[PDB]
Amino acid sequence: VVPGMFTRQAWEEAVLPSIDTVINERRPEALRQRLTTRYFADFGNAWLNFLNSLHLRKAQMLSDVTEQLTLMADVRQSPLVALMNTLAVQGRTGQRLHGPLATTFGPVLALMDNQNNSADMLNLQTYLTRVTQVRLRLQQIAGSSDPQAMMQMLAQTVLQGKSVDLTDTRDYGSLTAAGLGQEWYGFGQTVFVRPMEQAWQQVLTPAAESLNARWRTAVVDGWNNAFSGRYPFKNVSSDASLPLLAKYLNTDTGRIARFL
Amino acid sequence: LQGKSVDLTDTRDYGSLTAAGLGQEWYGFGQTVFVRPMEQAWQQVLTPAAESLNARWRTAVVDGWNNAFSGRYPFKNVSSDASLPLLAKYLNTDTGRIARFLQNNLSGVLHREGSRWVPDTINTRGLTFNPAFLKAINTLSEIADVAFTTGNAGLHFELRPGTAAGVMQTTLITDNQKLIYVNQMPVWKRFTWPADTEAPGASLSWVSTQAGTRQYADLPGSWGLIRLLEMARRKAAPGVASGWSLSWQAQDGRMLNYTLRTEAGEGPLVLLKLRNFVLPETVFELSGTSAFTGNDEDAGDTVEETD
Amino acid sequence: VVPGMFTRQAWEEAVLPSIDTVINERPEALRQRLTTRYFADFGNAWLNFLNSLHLRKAQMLSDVTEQLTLMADVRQSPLVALMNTLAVQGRTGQGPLATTFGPVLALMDNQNNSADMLNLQTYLTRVTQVRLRLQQIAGSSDPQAMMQMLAQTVLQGKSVDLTDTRDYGSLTAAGLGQEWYGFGQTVFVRPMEQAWQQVLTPAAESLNARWRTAVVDGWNNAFSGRYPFKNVSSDASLPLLAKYLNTDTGRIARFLQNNLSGVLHREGSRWVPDTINTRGLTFNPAFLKAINTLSEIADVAFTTGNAGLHFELRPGTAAGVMQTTLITDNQKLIYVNQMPVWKRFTWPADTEAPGASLS
């Protein structure tokens, strides 16, 4: 974090309902709202400078984004759910109505799920557990085959196809993000999107070096087994067969054509 | 195993979320109420299904492969020979019946890779199969990628001049493509192995120093060239690239030599792999769990090439 | 054994001599002399106990599942109770810690502000992940097979987990300040290391069987007793050398790209085994010496995939010698002491009767 929140925590609305009235007499109600309005306008302005620049999510290196997706989704050790309760109870102590429209209609509404299609916090919190379900089953419980053979499968079915577990959680992490104000844009960018890019950066480079190790058993051995030491590749007497080479270098039916 | 959304996969996908959606203290609880009553169905679904594919496989293609090719030549040494173009429906790469059994009946189990059949892409544990099947499909696909390139089932291979010792006029005929030889300058020639309509067959005839022509052996039938080539397999030669020679020790000590050069892999010598070849029994058998027999495919060619 | 007579956890009993060394005599550094020497015995008589810690052996599969679970399962995890015992007596300097429990208490919960080496909370999770896989093979799926079914994933499949689970033992005991507290952490590295020593030990007894079968048997049944191995005059066999010792399609060049990749890695002519994944794996130096001979042959003899080379030569002159010898494979070179020139040869020449002689 980068700190902020300077002496405007909601405790001081229990020891300063006094000094706003102390200045009313020396200088009564026409100044009272004049102080209360300026103070509550400088309230959310204090907290948005701490609540926009949180940070990146401390971008993680190889293969161990499964730990972060458990320390975002677990209910008794969450550093997110407790922060949501912090925003609830230190946002209501601003008096429900005169608790300002800044620090209410952002993240306080998303906590209380209505009995409808409201973009609640619980749905992204369940989809995060599904993505770390698939990724935890990928690495450790690769069922005696490599994770590479499934890494290539996921990087096959995301990039060109439709509707797998990763393509939908990032779709869900945009309507709750940009569905907030102009001021919580810098907040909704870094809790609701960035725990998907930290899986997207650690899903495709194992697949990128897995397509290699499948490519040197799919067609390279079949191409260096028939045409190894014949004429038009190494200057030896005997020559490579003409009609067998048509099964590799065609444009629609050959194996090199049926690999790409 | 290969599709999506039956009643088995979704209940386990449900049994994961409510289990790992608890704390770190009820992890050991949620592992044994919500997931483990699916593994006790998963262990009792597939081994009856493992030994059912056996009993479908010995009525789908094995009886078809032993009904047409039962007692003919290149599997048991009888006179009459197995028909050539009917075999092209059983050994093609993409349209034959064996090629149309391993693309939809177990498509998540054996991926077609190169020319052999790689087993370790099941992503599955607790299910291994007979190594006899995995060798007996690899040999057949090696036949599929040497002889049969265009479906019409014909290869062609370069030819043999002679260098001899005390014998002249070495003559061989196959499929009305002559080779007469009287110790000229040795020059290669070319044989296509299945020819057009003729009297198809093959024979070898030499002329001794004190007697005229006497033919070595004549063998009739379209499957003729592979029969008389069997007899003299002292082969391995350190010369040309495919590097083969033939001995053909005929009567009274006059040996007439040759030197075979093939084009695509091994030529028509690879058709001698088919003798005593039966498509084996069951796949997916429980027996044979730990066995390392990955040396016969090298040792058979060791005995073949050196002797 | 021998935890000594720990003079700590009785800190009130040294409060009264902190006053008795000044008031009883008639200078303030006499309190500070003993205050700096209040934790010399703490820096010895706790430091020797952590190095007094060792392990108890497991030496089977199920004992590793028993031994390793007791360390990570947080309720009744008496490693965490021991680390809390060590977290009790060093929390104050007496932030910064004036005693030498400084770097050890950077493991308990240090609030890792960008010095992200390792927390003890993270390290215990990687122990449970190994417990899960070690429970899978023991979990009634023919464990003589599933252990090898795991053991192939370490070598050649190049799994994604193997970079992280091994390196936490390296990146904790090295980074744990004193080498003695790193030695106590070396007592707490080994349950990872002994676990992978348990897993990768049947991998040796399986891969030695498969390498005895797939190359060595077809080698010795074919090539033993010919000329260039045992000095006899029988049965030169050339073109099987280009089927074994070839560069790309030979079976020895197949075995190194289908079952021992990830540890063996081709670099030019040789394949020196260099990564962090070779830890817990010691190569027979006979093997690495033999297969660097059988890859430097494949850059002279069989460069075109089959047999054949090319080389030229030139004779000389001597006393009484005026002649010519080499006729090798029907390309003669004749000299009667004329001017010397270079003639082109070929070793596996196309003839029905190979041989050489001299004259």
mmCIF file of N, CA, C and O in Angstrom, chain B residues 17-62:
data_model
loop_
_atom_site.group_PDB
_atom_site.id
_atom_site.type_symbol
_atom_site.label_atom_id
_atom_site.label_comp_id
_atom_site.label_asym_id
_atom_site.label_seq_id
_atom_site.Cartn_x
_atom_site.Cartn_y
_atom_site.Cartn_z
ATOM 1 N N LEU B 17 -16.393 -27.458 -5.299
ATOM 2 C CA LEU B 17 -16.565 -26.056 -4.921
ATOM 3 C C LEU B 17 -17.049 -25.908 -3.488
ATOM 4 O O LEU B 17 -16.525 -25.077 -2.739
ATOM 5 N N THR B 18 -18.048 -26.694 -3.086
ATOM 6 C CA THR B 18 -18.500 -26.632 -1.703
ATOM 7 C C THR B 18 -17.474 -27.207 -0.740
ATOM 8 O O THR B 18 -17.507 -26.874 0.447
ATOM 9 N N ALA B 19 -16.559 -28.050 -1.219
ATOM 10 C CA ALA B 19 -15.517 -28.585 -0.350
ATOM 11 C C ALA B 19 -14.428 -27.553 -0.108
ATOM 12 O O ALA B 19 -14.141 -27.191 1.036
ATOM 13 N N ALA B 20 -13.807 -27.065 -1.180
ATOM 14 C CA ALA B 20 -12.724 -26.108 -1.005
ATOM 15 C C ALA B 20 -13.216 -24.691 -0.763
ATOM 16 O O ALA B 20 -12.386 -23.795 -0.582
ATOM 17 N N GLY B 21 -14.527 -24.461 -0.764
ATOM 18 C CA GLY B 21 -15.084 -23.178 -0.396
ATOM 19 C C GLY B 21 -15.209 -22.941 1.089
ATOM 20 O O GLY B 21 -15.643 -21.863 1.501
ATOM 21 N N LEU B 22 -14.842 -23.923 1.905
ATOM 22 C CA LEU B 22 -14.803 -23.781 3.353
ATOM 23 C C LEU B 22 -13.441 -23.212 3.753
ATOM 24 O O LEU B 22 -12.686 -22.725 2.910
ATOM 25 N N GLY B 23 -13.112 -23.266 5.039
ATOM 26 C CA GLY B 23 -11.850 -22.760 5.534
ATOM 27 C C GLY B 23 -10.664 -23.654 5.226
ATOM 28 O O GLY B 23 -10.718 -24.557 4.388
ATOM 29 N N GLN B 24 -9.560 -23.369 5.912
ATOM 30 C CA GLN B 24 -8.405 -24.252 5.908
ATOM 31 C C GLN B 24 -8.460 -25.278 7.021
ATOM 32 O O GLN B 24 -7.542 -26.096 7.140
ATOM 33 N N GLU B 25 -9.503 -25.254 7.837
ATOM 34 C CA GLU B 25 -9.632 -26.255 8.877
ATOM 35 C C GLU B 25 -10.582 -27.370 8.465
ATOM 36 O O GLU B 25 -10.387 -28.516 8.859
ATOM 37 N N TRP B 26 -11.582 -27.069 7.647
ATOM 38 C CA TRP B 26 -12.513 -28.075 7.162
ATOM 39 C C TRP B 26 -12.132 -28.573 5.819
ATOM 40 O O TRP B 26 -12.973 -29.143 5.128
ATOM 41 N N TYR B 27 -10.883 -28.347 5.425
ATOM 42 C CA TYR B 27 -10.388 -28.923 4.187
ATOM 43 C C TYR B 27 -10.352 -30.442 4.272
ATOM 44 O O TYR B 27 -10.810 -31.135 3.353
ATOM 45 N N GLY B 28 -9.841 -30.973 5.386
ATOM 46 C CA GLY B 28 -9.830 -32.411 5.586
ATOM 47 C C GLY B 28 -11.213 -33.004 5.774
ATOM 48 O O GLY B 28 -11.412 -34.200 5.549
ATOM 49 N N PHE B 29 -12.181 -32.186 6.187
ATOM 50 C CA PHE B 29 -13.566 -32.643 6.225
ATOM 51 C C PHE B 29 -14.174 -32.667 4.832
ATOM 52 O O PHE B 29 -14.757 -33.673 4.418
ATOM 53 N N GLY B 30 -14.077 -31.549 4.110
ATOM 54 C CA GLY B 30 -14.674 -31.426 2.794
ATOM 55 C C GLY B 30 -14.071 -32.347 1.765
ATOM 56 O O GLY B 30 -14.720 -32.647 0.761
ATOM 57 N N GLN B 31 -12.853 -32.825 2.003
ATOM 58 C CA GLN B 31 -12.275 -33.819 1.116
ATOM 59 C C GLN B 31 -12.946 -35.187 1.242
ATOM 60 O O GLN B 31 -12.896 -35.970 0.289
ATOM 61 N N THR B 32 -13.620 -35.492 2.353
ATOM 62 C CA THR B 32 -14.117 -36.850 2.540
ATOM 63 C C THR B 32 -15.630 -36.942 2.685
ATOM 64 O O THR B 32 -16.137 -37.977 3.124
ATOM 65 N N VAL B 33 -16.376 -35.893 2.348
ATOM 66 C CA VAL B 33 -17.831 -36.015 2.291
ATOM 67 C C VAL B 33 -18.312 -35.660 0.891
ATOM 68 O O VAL B 33 -19.297 -36.218 0.398
ATOM 69 N N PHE B 34 -17.596 -34.765 0.217
ATOM 70 C CA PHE B 34 -18.104 -34.159 -1.004
ATOM 71 C C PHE B 34 -17.397 -34.595 -2.274
ATOM 72 O O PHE B 34 -17.929 -34.357 -3.361
ATOM 73 N N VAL B 35 -16.234 -35.222 -2.180
ATOM 74 C CA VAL B 35 -15.511 -35.691 -3.347
ATOM 75 C C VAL B 35 -15.441 -37.208 -3.383
ATOM 76 O O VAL B 35 -15.759 -37.830 -4.396
ATOM 77 N N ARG B 36 -15.055 -37.815 -2.277
ATOM 78 C CA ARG B 36 -14.884 -39.255 -2.126
ATOM 79 C C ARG B 36 -16.104 -40.143 -2.401
ATOM 80 O O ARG B 36 -15.913 -41.324 -2.708
ATOM 81 N N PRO B 37 -17.366 -39.673 -2.296
ATOM 82 C CA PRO B 37 -18.456 -40.485 -2.855
ATOM 83 C C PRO B 37 -18.682 -40.320 -4.351
ATOM 84 O O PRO B 37 -19.755 -40.670 -4.849
ATOM 85 N N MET B 38 -17.710 -39.769 -5.076
ATOM 86 C CA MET B 38 -17.677 -39.884 -6.527
ATOM 87 C C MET B 38 -16.574 -40.801 -7.027
ATOM 88 O O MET B 38 -16.738 -41.434 -8.074
ATOM 89 N N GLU B 39 -15.466 -40.903 -6.292
ATOM 90 C CA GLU B 39 -14.399 -41.819 -6.673
ATOM 91 C C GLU B 39 -14.824 -43.269 -6.506
ATOM 92 O O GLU B 39 -14.351 -44.145 -7.233
ATOM 93 N N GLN B 40 -15.732 -43.542 -5.571
ATOM 94 C CA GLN B 40 -16.235 -44.900 -5.423
ATOM 95 C C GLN B 40 -17.212 -45.293 -6.522
ATOM 96 O O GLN B 40 -17.560 -46.474 -6.617
ATOM 97 N N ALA B 41 -17.661 -44.349 -7.349
ATOM 98 C CA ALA B 41 -18.348 -44.711 -8.582
ATOM 99 C C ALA B 41 -17.385 -44.710 -9.760
ATOM 100 O O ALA B 41 -17.546 -45.489 -10.711
ATOM 101 N N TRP B 42 -16.378 -43.844 -9.711
ATOM 102 C CA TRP B 42 -15.410 -43.783 -10.792
ATOM 103 C C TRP B 42 -14.498 -44.999 -10.838
ATOM 104 O O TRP B 42 -14.031 -45.366 -11.918
ATOM 105 N N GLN B 43 -14.242 -45.637 -9.702
ATOM 106 C CA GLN B 43 -13.479 -46.874 -9.712
ATOM 107 C C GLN B 43 -14.315 -48.076 -10.105
ATOM 108 O O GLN B 43 -13.748 -49.123 -10.424
ATOM 109 N N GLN B 44 -15.640 -47.960 -10.090
ATOM 110 C CA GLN B 44 -16.500 -49.081 -10.434
ATOM 111 C C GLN B 44 -17.303 -48.841 -11.702
ATOM 112 O O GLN B 44 -18.258 -49.567 -11.976
ATOM 113 N N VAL B 45 -16.951 -47.824 -12.480
ATOM 114 C CA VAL B 45 -17.494 -47.685 -13.821
ATOM 115 C C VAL B 45 -16.546 -48.213 -14.896
ATOM 116 O O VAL B 45 -16.989 -48.900 -15.823
ATOM 117 N N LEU B 46 -15.233 -47.976 -14.782
ATOM 118 C CA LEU B 46 -14.424 -48.135 -15.984
ATOM 119 C C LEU B 46 -13.838 -49.529 -16.176
ATOM 120 O O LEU B 46 -13.538 -49.888 -17.318
ATOM 121 N N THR B 47 -13.647 -50.327 -15.126
ATOM 122 C CA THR B 47 -13.061 -51.637 -15.426
ATOM 123 C C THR B 47 -14.037 -52.645 -16.058
ATOM 124 O O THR B 47 -13.583 -53.448 -16.895
ATOM 125 N N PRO B 48 -15.352 -52.646 -15.757
ATOM 126 C CA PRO B 48 -16.278 -53.314 -16.687
ATOM 127 C C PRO B 48 -16.274 -52.710 -18.079
ATOM 128 O O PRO B 48 -16.339 -53.449 -19.070
ATOM 129 N N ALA B 49 -16.151 -51.392 -18.190
ATOM 130 C CA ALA B 49 -16.001 -50.780 -19.500
ATOM 131 C C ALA B 49 -14.643 -51.059 -20.122
ATOM 132 O O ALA B 49 -14.516 -51.001 -21.348
ATOM 133 N N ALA B 50 -13.629 -51.351 -19.310
ATOM 134 C CA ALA B 50 -12.346 -51.768 -19.857
ATOM 135 C C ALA B 50 -12.460 -53.135 -20.500
ATOM 136 O O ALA B 50 -11.980 -53.349 -21.616
ATOM 137 N N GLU B 51 -13.103 -54.077 -19.822
ATOM 138 C CA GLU B 51 -13.202 -55.386 -20.454
ATOM 139 C C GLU B 51 -14.442 -55.544 -21.339
ATOM 140 O O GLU B 51 -14.713 -56.659 -21.788
ATOM 141 N N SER B 52 -15.205 -54.480 -21.598
ATOM 142 C CA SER B 52 -16.227 -54.551 -22.643
ATOM 143 C C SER B 52 -15.698 -54.231 -24.037
ATOM 144 O O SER B 52 -16.208 -54.777 -25.031
ATOM 145 N N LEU B 53 -14.712 -53.335 -24.130
ATOM 146 C CA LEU B 53 -14.105 -53.007 -25.411
ATOM 147 C C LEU B 53 -13.387 -54.201 -26.018
ATOM 148 O O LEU B 53 -13.359 -54.320 -27.243
ATOM 149 N N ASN B 54 -12.849 -55.088 -25.180
ATOM 150 C CA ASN B 54 -12.379 -56.404 -25.604
ATOM 151 C C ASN B 54 -13.441 -57.164 -26.387
ATOM 152 O O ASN B 54 -13.213 -57.599 -27.528
ATOM 153 N N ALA B 55 -14.594 -57.375 -25.762
ATOM 154 C CA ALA B 55 -15.625 -58.221 -26.332
ATOM 155 C C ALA B 55 -16.350 -57.557 -27.488
ATOM 156 O O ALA B 55 -17.080 -58.244 -28.210
ATOM 157 N N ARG B 56 -16.194 -56.248 -27.668
ATOM 158 C CA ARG B 56 -16.623 -55.652 -28.929
ATOM 159 C C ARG B 56 -15.544 -55.720 -30.007
ATOM 160 O O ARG B 56 -15.871 -55.849 -31.193
ATOM 161 N N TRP B 57 -14.274 -55.649 -29.620
ATOM 162 C CA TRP B 57 -13.160 -55.692 -30.551
ATOM 163 C C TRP B 57 -12.959 -57.059 -31.172
ATOM 164 O O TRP B 57 -12.415 -57.140 -32.274
ATOM 165 N N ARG B 58 -13.365 -58.135 -30.507
ATOM 166 C CA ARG B 58 -13.282 -59.440 -31.156
ATOM 167 C C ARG B 58 -14.593 -59.841 -31.830
ATOM 168 O O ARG B 58 -14.859 -61.026 -32.050
ATOM 169 N N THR B 59 -15.404 -58.857 -32.204
ATOM 170 C CA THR B 59 -16.458 -59.066 -33.185
ATOM 171 C C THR B 59 -16.485 -57.947 -34.215
ATOM 172 O O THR B 59 -17.042 -58.133 -35.301
ATOM 173 N N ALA B 60 -15.835 -56.820 -33.953
ATOM 174 C CA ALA B 60 -15.829 -55.722 -34.907
ATOM 175 C C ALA B 60 -14.796 -55.882 -36.018
ATOM 176 O O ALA B 60 -15.116 -55.653 -37.184
ATOM 177 N N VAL B 61 -13.551 -56.225 -35.689
ATOM 178 C CA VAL B 61 -12.495 -56.233 -36.696
ATOM 179 C C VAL B 61 -11.635 -57.494 -36.678
ATOM 180 O O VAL B 61 -11.062 -57.856 -37.720
ATOM 181 N N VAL B 62 -11.562 -58.252 -35.581
ATOM 182 C CA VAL B 62 -10.681 -59.416 -35.529
ATOM 183 C C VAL B 62 -11.259 -60.561 -36.336
ATOM 184 O O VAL B 62 -10.534 -61.268 -37.044
#
